[PDB]
Amino acid sequence: AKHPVPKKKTSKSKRDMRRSHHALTAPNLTECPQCHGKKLSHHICPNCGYYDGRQVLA
Amino acid sequence: LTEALPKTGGRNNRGRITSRFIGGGHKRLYRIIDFKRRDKSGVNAKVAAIEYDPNRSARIALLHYADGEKRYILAPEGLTVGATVNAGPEAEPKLGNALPLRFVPVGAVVHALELVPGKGAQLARSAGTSVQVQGKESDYVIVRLPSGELRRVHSECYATIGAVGNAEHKNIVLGKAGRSRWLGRKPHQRGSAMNPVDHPHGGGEGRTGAGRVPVTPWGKPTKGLKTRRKRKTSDRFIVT
RNA sequence: CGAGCUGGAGAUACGCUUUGACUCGGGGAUGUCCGAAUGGGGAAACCCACCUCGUAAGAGGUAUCCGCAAGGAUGGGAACUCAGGGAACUGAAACAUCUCAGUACCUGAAGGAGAAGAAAGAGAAUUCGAUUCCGUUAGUAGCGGCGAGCGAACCCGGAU
RNA sequence: GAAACGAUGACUGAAUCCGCGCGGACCACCGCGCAAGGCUAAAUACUCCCAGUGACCGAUAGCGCAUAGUACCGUGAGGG
RNA sequence: CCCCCGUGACAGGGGGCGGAGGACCGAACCGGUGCCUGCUGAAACAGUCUCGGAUGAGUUGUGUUUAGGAGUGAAAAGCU
RNA sequence: AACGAUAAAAGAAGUGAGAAUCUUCUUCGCCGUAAGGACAAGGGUUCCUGGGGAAGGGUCGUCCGCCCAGGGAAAGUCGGGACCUAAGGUGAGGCCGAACGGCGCAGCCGAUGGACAGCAGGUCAAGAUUCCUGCACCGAUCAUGUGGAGUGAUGGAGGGACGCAUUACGCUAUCCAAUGCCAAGCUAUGGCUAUGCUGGUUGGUACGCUCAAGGGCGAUCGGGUCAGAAAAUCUACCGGUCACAUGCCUCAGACGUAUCGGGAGCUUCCUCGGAAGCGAAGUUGGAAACGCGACGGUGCCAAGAAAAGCUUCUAAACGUUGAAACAUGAUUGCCCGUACCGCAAACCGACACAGGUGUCCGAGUGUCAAUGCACUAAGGCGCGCGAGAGAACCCUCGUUAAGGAACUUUGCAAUCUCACCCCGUAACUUCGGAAGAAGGGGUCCCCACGCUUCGCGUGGGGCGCAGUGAAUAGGCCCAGGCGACUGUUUACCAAAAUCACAGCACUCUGCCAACACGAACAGUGGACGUAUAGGGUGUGACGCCUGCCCGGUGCCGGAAGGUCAAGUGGAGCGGUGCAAGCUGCGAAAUGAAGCCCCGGUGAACGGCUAAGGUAGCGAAAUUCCUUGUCGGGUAAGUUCCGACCUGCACGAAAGGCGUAACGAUCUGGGCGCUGUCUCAACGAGGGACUCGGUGAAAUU
Ligand SMILES: CC[C@H]1OC(=O)[C@H](C)[C@@H](OC(=O)N2CCC[C@@H]2c2cccnc2)[C@H](C)[C@@H](O[C@@H]2O[C@H](C)C[C@H](N(C)C)[C@H]2O)[C@](C)(OC)C[C@@H](C)C(=O)[C@H](C)[C@H]2NC(=O)O[C@@]21C
Ligand SMILES: [Mg+2]
Ligand SMILES: [Mg+2]
Ligand SMILES: [Mg+2]
Ligand SMILES: [Mg+2]
Ligand SMILES: [Mg+2]
Ligand SMILES: [Mg+2]
Ligand SMILES: [Mg+2]
Ligand SMILES: [Mg+2]
Ligand SMILES: [Mg+2]
Ligand SMILES: [Mg+2]
Ligand SMILES: [Mg+2]
Incomplete structure (x- = not known):
């Protein structure tokens, strides 16, 4: 058949313990020096399209 | 043609x-x-x-x-x-003439012999087959058939002068399987190569044999397959 | 019947109905093509014809088996009925006669039922008085590798 | 089986009322009955269908279906 | 079949010319040899590579026939 | 875990709530005897348009083969039917059978076959040999004239009408070349300025004192009835007269003139892109089919459907006053099929599945050839998750020092070899073979000279490590077993030494054959055959051969006798009634095939008590003891070869021994080469790891 197979159901406890590292880390959001919508460090502000001057359209 | x-x-x-x-x-x-x-x-x-x-x-x-x-x-x-x-009773003992046995001289070699006046030729038809006439009895003539059997055939029946054509089926050596195929399917399949189910010579462990019989029941080397028939009275001396 | 109706339909539009719609009860009239299928063919529901009447549309006919002819038969029915044919698993703690069982199944014929029926009988009283069915006799009499097991009928009571 | 009687595939084959068949081999006596032509209602059986009822079910029950012999499966019979 | 050379018991040998074969190599096509891969597959039997046949006892379409102790079988109790 | 082939993908622009994924543009890459194109089957609206965006789509969708609505499919000539027959199916009458049913002459059904009238273009969003434009053809009914007398079946004949291989001449579709023609422009990086570059370069029909290979043919008179049921003016047969070459008849195709068409492109409008209008050239040379001429030629044995249409005859019938045939007008033109997918994401495979599916077309360059191989036209496509990373390990690859089988059950695997030309080539042989044996050499470019080309030969010269410069592309040899050989087999673990085979033998079978299927005195196969044939059984090319035993068993044969069934035959014993009678059982003798009994029989079952192995083989696909013993080869040899004979337990058609050739067969050795190995390394791609999307399983 399907050669190595689990021997016993993994308990609600054991299953959950394994998920103690699955939690997403929230982005470190910065506020744009211009358009004043929040942005990602080292990226162009989505809203105004600025990164010192304006690079992207809108 | x-x-x-x-x-x-x-x-x-x-x-x-x-x-x-x-x-x-x-x-x-x-x-x-x-x-x-x-x-x-x-x-x-x-x-x-x-x-x-x-x-x-x-x-x-x-x-x-x-x-x-x-x-x-x-x-x-x-x-x-x-x-x-x-053709007809009026005929010389020349090749290919059709003439009834009474008009046929004794010691004469014939082919395409009938059995009943009419119906058509029934004996010595395949290449090189001959019927040696032995001599009349009444309405019946004693004849030697290709097998060697002596039959009482009534003189009322036609015959053709001489032995059959296509000289000899001898230099015809077929050659290879497939020459036999230009005619009849994968010949003789040995019953010894069969399985118990299929035929009595079936089974065993290897090459063998044990009582000698055909496909269905019977026995095969020697067994009078001829019945207790009426055509027997019009027949004298069979074997060989 | 007596005011609603326009099918389920939960749907709008057009309408119909006290000169009695709708619905219900009872008759008729139309009933394409296939199917016994039947003009001939066919891979059901489609191809292809001929004959008669006819202004074309359209209508009628054209299968075999019975008999003079009128008129009858083919095909379909859940189960029930009789008939022709008729298993094995199974029981016998094996198996072969026996049992399962004349059961299951196939086939034929038919009807609302059929079957059977008017004593060359049952039978032991010189009683009975067509048949079928029910109770009973009776697991008696008997049959039986006298084993597993199988099993009446007469009398009597009753439906008719 | 001591196997009568019915029944019939093969062969045979009678009597005609001082006659024929039966009565559990068979005989005699006693007794019951007239085959070799046909029909014949009612009582009996069954339930596709219809009505009524129920110490029947109430959605895994009850019919396979609160409706479907559908969807689905199978070349098909069939299964569902 | 046509030109050439041979004679001790011999057979033929050579040139042209023809175009035979269950002949050869090899695609298509039929096939399945060896390895690996695939092994809850891409796939209820496959893939790449290698390999057998390839004018024959060849391969293939339609149409039709034979089945259940029956059929079919260049014969494995194979296939139905 | 996976997201279904390792044929890629990139950017721009667009759309939209939303875009790796939808549209468009420019590139890139993969197929291109297909991964293009046209049918058939099969599927069923999947087609086109406009919308949609739950679910289906292995991700996402604004999109789709999914969902909704509307549309689309056009035939006298193409397939099928109103025509024909094959296998087979059915089948009045007929032949059989418990039933149900099974057979069966004609006839009828039945294409996979025969027969039969149309081509060139145009273009819907989606059909086209169907619609439309142009110019044809087929049959039917009638009309008007020609014409002036037959017309000719349900039956006759001819004819339709048939293989495989090979091959001569001519052509076409079609393809190539060019400083042929025609058309458009421009090119510049260094040059060319066009003799460069790109593209196009003829389809149908009518006529023509034009060319033309090839292909098909006798015409008449008469005689015999005994032939075609009869008749025949038709056909066969026999005879007579002109049958050499020729002679007639036919033009595949070419050429020319005309004409309708198409034609590269250009021209204007543009509602985001299509519609409309116009139109040049048409050369010379080369190649060339599996198609056409055609039913050609030759060779061969295994000896190559039928029926209708058709052409010719008379019979009967109507008519010889209005015949048939032709010509030109009109009229007529039924039914089903036609979209789309159709080597596939629309069919079969439960899936948008790496399989399977019959036919046709399938361009160019190079390469002896080719449908091979590489690249590439036209056309189609990048395979419905994606993006990083650059671990172990696993898959598919590239290279590898020194060694070269030491690996191991085994060179398993993987290299080497590799095409064409020239030289050269063994034992052994069935004189064919073995053979591509083995081995060695050449191969590219330019020039000059020669010839038989697409090309080749000789000379000299050039370049590179290298010249079938990349792809396709035999490793070879020695000895053995087994089987002669090509072939066949276990769909899905066995391809073989299995089966088959040509050949040999025994044997049965005389024709309503044996034998076989079957309810059957049916019917049919055997066989429309006939002992030089058919059934069965065995052995298994060819060569030399095949011994001994007939007691047992079986088969064929004899019969002095013994044994034996029903039946014929009834001697006797017994029941009952008073009695004739009616009844229960019953010997002897006679009564069949069989069996016991006697002879035969081995390419009958068998044996080596009925006899104890003739040749040949032998430690063998057979041998236990066993790794027998001696020799070979190896440094070393349980295997292998050879001898020997002590054959546990070879041996003559369950064939014995041998045999050239053949083998994806099995065993042993050698050369070559090599990552099999000492002993592993590096490198590549695809997984594995990481992120975002979707998200299974056995097990418990
Ligand atoms: C390839 C997948 C295929 O497996 C195989 O074929 C292998 C090779 C086969 O091995 C084999 O059959 N064999 C035959 C001997 C060599 C090989 C084997 C055996 C054991 C381990 N590995 C290999 C098994 C291991 C074998 O089991 C074995 O059976 C033996 C009878 C006993 C063993 N026991 C003792 C553990 C058992 O494992 C069985 C019988 O199968 C066929 C197992 C049963 C459960 C089965 O049918 C599966 C569903 C099977 N069918 C399928 O489609 O998938 C499977 C899993
Ligand atoms: Mg509930
Ligand atoms: Mg119902
Ligand atoms: Mg090869
Ligand atoms: Mg080969
Ligand atoms: Mg017939
Ligand atoms: Mg990736
Ligand atoms: Mg990092
Ligand atoms: Mg040897
Ligand atoms: Mg072999
Ligand atoms: Mg072979
Ligand atoms: Mg993830």
Whole structure:
């Protein structure tokens, strides 16, 4: 058949313990020096399209 | 080659393989042969040509009658193109003449012999077969059949002068499987190569044999397969 | 019947109905093509014809088996009925006669039922008085590798 | 089986009322009955269908279906 | 079949010319040899590579026939 | 875990709530005897348009083969039917059978076959040999004239009408070349300025004192009835007269003139892109079919459907006053099929599945050839998750020092070899073979000279490590077993030494054959055959051969006798009634095939008590003891070869021994080469790891 197979159901406890590292880390959001919508460090502000001057359209 | 019929292959009867084996073949056509000849009594015919005939073994002769009716006859050993052939009681002991046994001299060699006046030729038809006449008894004539058997055939029955054609089926050595295929399917399948289910020589561990019998029950080397029939009275001396 | 109706349909538009719609009860009239299928063919519901009447449309006929002819038969029915044919698993703690069982199944014929029926009988009283069915006799009498097991009928009571 | 009687595939084959068949081999006596022509209602059986009822079910029950012999499966019979 | 050379018991040998074969190599096509891969597959039997046949006892379409102790079988109790 | 082939993908622009994924543009890459194109089967609206965006789509969708609505499919000539027949199916009458049913002559059904009238273009969003434009053809009914007398079946004949291989001449579709023609422009990086570059370069029909290979043919008179049921003016047969070359008849195709068409492109409008209008050239040379001429030629054995249409005859019938045939007008033109997918994401495979599916077309360059191989036209496509990373390990690859089988059950695997030309080639042989044996050499470019080309030969010269410069592309040899050989087999673990085979033998079978299927005195196969044939059984090319035993068993044969069934025959014993009678059982003798009994029989079952192995083989696909013993080869040899004979337990058609050739067969050795190995390394791609999307399983 399907050669190595689990021997016993993994308990609600054991299953959950394994998920103690699955939690997403929230982005470190910065506020744009211009358009004043929040942005990602080292990226162009989505809203105004600025990164010192304006690079992207809108 | 002149005004014939279509011979269609078939080895099974009502559905089932009834004559074991039998298959391949070069798709042959049927040539109608005048085996009786009675109705052409008195009329002379010219040997137009000796044609090839699959379905036989005996070469075929094309007869060109004076009345312009064309017929086919088993070509006897010797008959050449441009010779005359006559049917009826009035006939010389020359090649290819059809004449009843009473008019046939003793010690004469014949082929295409009947059995009942009419019906058509029934004995010594395949190439090189001969019927040696022994001498009359009453209405009946004692004749030597290709097997060696002596039969009481009534003189009322026709015969043809001489031995059958196609000289000898000897230099015909077939050669390879497949020559046999130009004719009949994968021949003799040994019952010893069979399984217990299939045939009595079936099974065992290796090459063998143990009681000697055919496909179905019976026995095979020696067993009188002839019945307690009436045709026996009209027969004197059989074996060999 | 007596005011609603326009099918389920949960749907709008057009309408119909006290000169009695709708619905219900009872008759008729139309009933394409296939199917016994029946003009002939066919891979059901489609191809292809001929004959008679006819203004074309359109209508009628054209299968075999019975008999003079009128008129009858083919085909379909859940189960029930009789008939022709008729298993084995199974029981016998094996198996072969026996049992399962004349059961299951196939086939034929038919009807609302059929079957059977008017004593060359049952039978032991010189009683009975067509048949079928029910109770009973009775697991008696008997049959039986006298084993497993199988099993009446007469009398009597009763439906008719 | 001591196997009567019915029944019939093969062969045979009678009597005609001082006659024929039966009565559990068979005989005699006693007794019951007239085959070799046909029909014949009612009582009996069954339930596709219809009505009524129920110490029947109430959605895994009850019919396979609160409706479907559908969807689905199978070349098909069939299964569902 | 046509030109050439041979004679001790011999057979033929040579040139042209023809175009035979269950002949050869090899695609298509039929096939399945060896390895690996695939092994809850891409796939209820496959893939790449290698390999057998390749004018024959060849391969293939339609149409039709034979089945259940029955059929079919260049014979494995194979296939139905 | 996976997201279904390792044929890629990139950017721009667009759309939209939303875009790796939808549209468009420019590139890139993969197929191109297909991964293009046209049918058939099969599927069923999947087609086109406009919308949609639950679910289906292995991700996402604004999109789709999914969902909704509307539309689309056009035939006298193409397939099928109103025509024909094959296998087979059915089948009045008929032949059989418990039933149900099974067979069966004609006839009828039945294409996979025969027969039969149309081509060139145009273009819907989606059909086209169907619609439309142009110019044809087929049959039917009638009309008007020609014409002036037959017309000719349900039957006759001819004819339709048939193989495989090979091959001569001519052509076409079609393809190539060019400083042929025609058309458009421009090119510049260094040059060319066009003799460069790109593209196009003829389809149908009518006529023509034009060319033309090839291909098909006798015409008449008469005689015999005994031939075609009869008749025949038709056909066969026999005879007579002109049958050499020729002679007639036919033009595949070419050429020319005309004409309708198409034609590269250009021209205007533009509602985001299509519609409309116009139109040049048409050369010379080369190649060339599996198609056409055609039913050609030759060779061969295994000896190559039928029926209708058709052409010719008379019979009967109507008519010889309005015949048939022709010509030109009109009229007429039924039914089903036609979209789309159709080597596939629309069919079969439960899936948008790496399989399977019959036919046709299938361009160019190079390469002896080719449908091979590489690249590439036209056309189609990048395979419905994606993006990083650059671990172990696993898959598919490239290279590898020194060694070269030491690996191991085994060179398993993987290299080497590799095409064409020239030289050269063994034992052994069935004189064919073995053979591509083995081995060695050449191969590219330019020039000059020669010839038989697409090309080749000789000379000299050039370049590179290298010249079938990349792809396709035999490793070879020695000895053995087994089987002669090609072939066949276990769909899905066995391809073989299995089966088959040509050949040999025994044997049965005389024809309503044996034998076989079957309810059956049916019917049919055997066989429209006939002992030079058919059934069965065995052995298994060819060569030399095949011994001994007939007691047992079986088969064929004899019969002095013994044994034996029903039946014929009834001697006797017994029941009952008073009695004739009616009844229960019953010997002897006679009564069949069989069996016991006698002889035969081995390419009958068998044996080596009925006899104890003739040749030949032998430690063998057979041998236990066993790794027998001696020799070979190896440094070393349980295997292998050879001898020997002590054959546990070879041996003559369950064939014995041998045999050239053949083998994806099995065993042993050698050369070559090599990552099999000492002993592993590096490198590549695809997984594995990481992120975002979707998200199974056995097990418990
Ligand atoms: C390839 C997948 C295929 O497996 C195989 O074929 C292998 C090779 C086969 O091995 C084999 O059959 N064999 C035959 C001997 C060599 C090989 C084997 C055996 C054991 C381990 N590995 C290999 C098994 C291991 C074998 O089991 C074995 O059976 C033996 C009878 C006993 C063993 N026991 C003792 C553990 C068992 O494992 C069985 C019988 O199968 C066929 C197992 C059963 C459960 C089965 O049918 C599966 C569903 C099977 N069918 C399928 O489609 O998938 C499977 C899993
Ligand atoms: Mg509930
Ligand atoms: Mg219902
Ligand atoms: Mg190869
Ligand atoms: Mg080979
Ligand atoms: Mg028939
Ligand atoms: Mg990736
Ligand atoms: Mg990092
Ligand atoms: Mg040896
Ligand atoms: Mg072999
Ligand atoms: Mg082979
Ligand atoms: Mg993830």
